[PDB]
Design a binder for this molecule. Sequence first.
Ligand SMILES: CCCCCCCCCCCCC/C=C/[C@H](O)[C@H](N)CO
Ligand SMILES: CCCCCCCCCCCCC/C=C/[C@H](O)[C@H](N)CO
Lengths: 245, 297, 99, 99, 58, 58, 242, 242, 49
Amino acid sequence: SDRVAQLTIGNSTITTQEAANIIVGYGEWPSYCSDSDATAVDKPTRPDVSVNRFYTLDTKLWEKSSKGWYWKFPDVLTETGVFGQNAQFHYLYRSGFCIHVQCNASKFHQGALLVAVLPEYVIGSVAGGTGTEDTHPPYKQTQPGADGFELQHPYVLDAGIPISQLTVCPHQWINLRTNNCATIIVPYINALPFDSALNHCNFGLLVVPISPLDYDQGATPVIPITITLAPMCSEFAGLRQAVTQ
Amino acid sequence: GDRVADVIESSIGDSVSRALTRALPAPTGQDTQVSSHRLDTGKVPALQAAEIGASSNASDESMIETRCVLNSHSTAETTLDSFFSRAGLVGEIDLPLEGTTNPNGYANWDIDITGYAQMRRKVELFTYMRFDAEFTFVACTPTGQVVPQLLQYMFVPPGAPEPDSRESLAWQTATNPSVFVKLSDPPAQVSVPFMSPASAYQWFYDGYPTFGEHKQEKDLEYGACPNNMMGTFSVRTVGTSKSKYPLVIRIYMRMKHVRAWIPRPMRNQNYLFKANPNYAGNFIKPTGASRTAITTL
Amino acid sequence: LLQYMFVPPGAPEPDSRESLAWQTATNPSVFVKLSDPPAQVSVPFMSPASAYQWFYDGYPTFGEHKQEKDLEYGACPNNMMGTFSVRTVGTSKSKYPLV
Amino acid sequence: EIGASSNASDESMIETRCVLNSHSTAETTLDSFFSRAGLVGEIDLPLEGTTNPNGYANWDIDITGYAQMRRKVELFTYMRFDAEFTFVACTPTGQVVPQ
Amino acid sequence: SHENSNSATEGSTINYTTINYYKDSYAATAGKQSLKQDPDKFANPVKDIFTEMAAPLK
Amino acid sequence: SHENSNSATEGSTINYTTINYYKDSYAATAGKQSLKQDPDKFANPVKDIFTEMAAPLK
Amino acid sequence: GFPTELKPGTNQFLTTDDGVSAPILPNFHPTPCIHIPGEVRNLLELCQVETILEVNNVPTNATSLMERLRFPVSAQAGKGELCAVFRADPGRSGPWQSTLLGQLCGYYTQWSGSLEVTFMFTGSFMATGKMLIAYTPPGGPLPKDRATAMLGTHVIWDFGLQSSVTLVIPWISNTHYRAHARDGVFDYYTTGLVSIWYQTNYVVPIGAPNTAYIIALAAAQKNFTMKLCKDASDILQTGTIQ
Amino acid sequence: GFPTELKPGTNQFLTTDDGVSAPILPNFHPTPCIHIPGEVRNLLELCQVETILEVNNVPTNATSLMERLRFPVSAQAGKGELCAVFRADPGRSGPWQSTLLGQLCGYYTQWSGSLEVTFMFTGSFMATGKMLIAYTPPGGPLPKDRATAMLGTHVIWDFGLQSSVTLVIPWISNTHYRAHARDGVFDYYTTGLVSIWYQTNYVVPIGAPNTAYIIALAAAQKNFTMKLCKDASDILQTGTIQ
Amino acid sequence: GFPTELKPGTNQFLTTDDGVSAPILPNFHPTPCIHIPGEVRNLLELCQV
Ligand SMILES: CCCCCCCCCCCCC/C=C/[C@H](O)[C@H](N)CO
Ligand SMILES: CCCCCCCCCCCCC/C=C/[C@H](O)[C@H](N)CO
C-alpha cells in the first residue's frame, strides 16, 4: 500500500513535484462491503492482501490522429497484465475499485478527454456486413490486452450507441486546460451475487478524446496517459477438476 | 503462534444519525449581501438572486389556492408503468385450411421482443428489468367472420420438449398447463409469472439443459431451430382431423410490475439481427436532421 | 368482428387498412363482435386549457387568426383534435353491409 | 457453528437472502405434486359403427389407463383424496353442434 | 406477519411480500406509511448552516 | 362447537371437521394456531446438555 | 339466474385496461430480488442529467462525424459578428434531437425543451476574450447587431478563470400550440432563439495555438413535466431483422 | 340485468385452476380416518433417507445384476492408481438414476444431486489399508496423480476401526445452466467429479480372503430444494396394458 | 356458474341511463380548472334577468 511495495517509482516522464492531485469526495476508505447470498452448494472465500496495493499498467500515448481506447474487466486482472498469480485458478470473483487517471502536459497544449465506465459493455464488433446472429462470439477483439485498443468509429461507439448520451454513466472531464487528475470509484455491478473467471466480463472503461489535441510546432507532440487501479474488497475461491493431488 | 493479520478498509465517525419522521418542508434560507450592484463594474455582469421557499397549500398558509391550471387533469403520466401502458400486437400466428405455412394445425411460437423493433428500442434503455406478463388471444377468419370451433392453448415452460406433430403426446401431457375455449366466446385473458432463473432478464448461458455462454466447446446455442429454450407457446385445432375454416390468431402482451436498473444510452443505429446488436459500420448515418449553416438556421 | 380505436389530438391519420397506425401501441383500441351488446365507453377532458374554445389549439404548428406560419387545413382533417377510426377485422373485405 | 434463523431469530438489521425474492419456495407439497389434471377418459361416440352404436357408453374410474399416472400414484400404500371431473365434447373435426 | 425476501434470503425486503387473494377482493405488493420495519428518512442533520464562511485558510 | 372424528369415533381428531358452506363464501378442513384442543409442542426438556462427557465407565 | 342485471358494456375488449388476471402456475416462487444499485424510479432524472449537445451539425459524412459536437472560436474577426444560433424546440429537429432530453420528448406532446445549459471551454491556458450570450423570448426577431442583443437578457462570458457558464432559459406559455381540427390548413409555429456574439477579439500570447473549441451541454430542472403519452413514430428499422 | 359488467375472461377453461366445486351426494359422511402411522407430510424426507448407490454399473445381463452395487478393493496394485470416478448429476444418467434422490429429481428442473454420502466396508476383520477420497469443484479437470488429488479437499480413510466414512459435497452456483432460446445450438455442460485413490496397498494376514467389497450410500440434508414442477417423461410402458 | 340468477332485464340498451363507465387513458390529469367568474349554477336566473 502507501505508495511503495515492489513498484516504488513516483515520478513519471515529466518528473513532477509539488504534492499530488486527487480531490477526494468520500471519507478516506468508507468501510468494507457486503457478502450477499447464494442459492446452491457453493461458497467463496477471501484472499485478504497481495491484491490490496496499487497497480500501474502501461502508458498509452495521445496524438492528433487519436480516436480513443477502451478496456475490459477483469481481463487486465488476469495474466494479461501485471497480475496473474491468483486470477486463473479460482472460480468466483467480486471487487470494488479505486481507479485513478493522471495526465500531464505543459501550459501551451489544448484538448480535453472524457472518462466513463459502462457496465455490461458488450461490444457489437465492427460489424458493417459481418453477418452473425449467434454462431461464435469473438475472443480476439473483446479481450485485446492490458494496452486496450483504439476505437474504429467513436461517434457510434463501435457498437451503434451514440457517444453524445454517454454522460449518463459516471464520468469526469479530463481537461488539459486546468487539472490533470481523475479519480473514480466503481462498486460491484452484477445480477448474480458472484461472477466467474470466464466470459462473463464485467464493466468496461472508456476514454474518448472529444476536444482534439493541438499545439504549435516545436513543443512536445505526444502527451502520455497514466492508468492506475486499486481492487477494493476482492475475493477468490472455487475449484474442481480432473485428477487431483 | 499467529504472526500475520491485516484487513482494515474501514472508516469511523459520522456514519448515521438520529431517527425522525418529519416529511414536511419549512421556510429555509433568507438573504445575504455581497457588494455594489452595477452592470459593468469590472468583474462579472448578470448577477444573481435568491428566494425563501413554499410548498403548495400544505407548507405555510393555505389562504389562497391559485394553481397554474384549474385542475385540468392528472400530473403523473410519467412512471414506468405509465411508459409501458399499451399492449402491442406481438404475435400474428396464421392458420390456413391448407398450404405450407402451418399444414398440420399445430403452430409453435415463443416469447421475444425482436418481433417489434420499436418495442425493442423502447425496452433496451436499461440493463436489468423485472416484470410480470399477461396475454390475450383473438381468433378470426381472414375475412373476419366468427365460426363455431374449439381451440387448444398451452404454455410450455423452459426446458420442456417441443410438440411437433398433432399426434405428439406432449399435447396430452399433464405438466404443461393448457386452456380450452371456443372462439365464439370472449378472448382468453391470462397471466404469466416471472420465469427467469435470476433476478433480472439477461441472456447468455440461461437456456438449454447443457452448457452455454460465450466461446462454446460443450454446447450449441441452436437446440435445432428453437434456439435459446425458454417460455414458448403451442396451439392446435381441436379435432381428430383438419378443420373447416381458415384461422388468424393474434397475441397481446402486456407488462405489469415493471422495475428497471442501470440506464444506458438508447441507440443510434438500425437493428440488424437477433441477440447480436451489430450495425451498418460502412453505412453509418447521422442522428438529427442536419441544417446548412450554423450562423443561420 | 369489429375494431374501434380512439385517436388523441395530434396523432397521424390512418388512411389505408394496411397503415401501421392501425397496429400502433399508443392509440387505445377496442375489439368486440357485433352480436355482443354495444360498447359503452368514456372519454376524459382532452382540452389543453380550462374550457372548450377553438382558434390556435390544434396542429403541432402555429394557428390563431391572420395566418402567416400555418394553415388551418391539415389537408382535409381541419383542426386536428379527438377523432375516431374504425375497420372491418379481416385480411380482406367483409360479407355484409354495415351501418 | 452456533445458529441463526432468518430475520426472525436474532437481530433483523440486514436482510440479505440468497435471491432477491425470485419466486415462491414451496412447490413440493403433495398437492403441488398432484397439480395438473390429466386427460384420463377419451370416450368416443360415432354416428354409426361398432364401438358405441346405441348411444350409450359405459366407463369407470381407474388409473391403469395412464401408466405414468399409475407410476406416480403407486409410491405409497394408503391414500385419501377427493376427486373432480370436467367434460369436453367435440366433433372429430372440432366443430360445436346444437345437441 | 412479515417475510424477509420470501423464504430465507435478504434483499427483497420491501420489494416482494405476500402472494395474492380471491378473484373479487385481491391485492398486490407494496409498502405503507404505518407499520414498517424501519423508516429510512432519518438523516439530514444539517440543512442550511453558515451561508458562505466555511474555511478561507489559504 | 367441536366434533371428534365426525360423529362418534376417534382418530380423525384434527383431520376432518365441519362440512362446507355457500357457493360464494366457502371453506375447508384444517387447523389454526389459536383455539386448539391441545398443543402437541410441549416436549424437549433437554436441548444441549453436556458437550461430550456422558459416561466413560469402561 | 341470480338477482342480477344484464350489463350493456361487457363482452367487449379494451387494449388499455386491467382486471382480474389468471396465474397458470400456482406452485411457484420466483427468485427473491436482491437490492442491485442503480434502480430507476421514474422516467425523469434522465431529463436533467448533463448530455453533450451538437450545434455545428454541418457534416453529414462518416469520418468528419466528430466535429458535429464542437465549434471553433478562432481569432479572425473579433468585434461584432455572430457565431451560431438555434431554436428551443426539443422534439422537432436539429440539436435537441441528439441529446437525451429530446429523445425522451419524442414520446410525449407537452414538452418544454428549455432551461439551463452549460458551455465548457478548451482554450490552452493563456487565452483571454469575452463572449456575449443572449436569449430572445418567443415571438421576437433575432437582433441584427450586438447592441440590440445586449438589451433584454444577456450575459458576458470571459476566459480568464471561467472555463464554464450556465445560462438558464425561462418558461412562458401564452398562445395555442396546435388546435388543428384538420391538417393542412394551419402552419403558424414560432419559438424564441439563442445567439452567440463575438464581444472582443480572441487574445493569445505568441506561442499558443490559434483555434480553440467550445463545447455545449444540456439539461433541465424540476419545474416542467411531460404529458399525454403518445406512441413514438420512427424509421429505426431495416425490414430484415432475423 | 344486474348492475354487472361483461367479463372478458370467462367462458374459457384452464387445466391448472380451481374454483367453486359441486358435490353430487349431500347425504354422505365418509369413514372418519383414524391415525395410521407413517403419514408423509412432504415430498421431502425421501431425499435424505439413505439408499444404496450403484457405481460399478458395468454389467448389463441378468444373473450378474448383483455386482452393479459394489466394487472390489483387492490387493494387486496398492500405491498410486485410481479405483473409480463419476459425476454429481442426479437426474441425467448413471449412478444417481438408480437411487431415490435421482428418481425424485426426475420430476423437477432445479436440482443439486449432491451433499453427504457414506461408504461401508466389508473386510473380514483383519484387513488394514488406507483409501484416498477427493472431490473436484465444478469447472476443473480430474487430477492425473494422487498428489494433485491430495490438494484442495480430500480425506484419508482407514480400515483399522472405521467401517464407515461420510464425505459431504459443498454446493456452489455460478454459471447459467441452460438459457436455450432454441435447441441444438448449445452443448456446454460441466460438473465437478469425485475420485477414489489407492493410498496404500491392501494388507492382510495369511489366512484371510484377498478381495473385499466396499458399498456406497447416498443422501442429502436440509439445505437444497427442488423447484419448477415439470412433467416427467419416461419409457416405463409396454403398450399392452390390459 | 356462480350462485347467480338469470336477469330478465339485461342485454338491452337505454338512451336516458347511466352506469359503470370505462376510461380509456389512465395516465392522464386534465388541466386544473381555475375560478373564472360568471359561473352559472342553474338554468334559472336567466328567467328573471
Ligand atoms: C445475447 C443477447 C444480448 C447480447 C449482449 C448485448 C447486451 C447485453 C445486455 C442486454 C441483453 C440482456 C439484458 C436484457 C435486455 C432486455 O431488456 C431483455 N431482452 C428484456 O426482455
Ligand atoms: C373558431 C370557431 C369559433 C369562432 C369564434 C366564434 C365564437 C367564439 C366563442 C365560441 C367558440 C369557442 C368557445 C366554445 C363554444 C362551444 O361551446 C364549443 N364548441 C363547445 O363544444
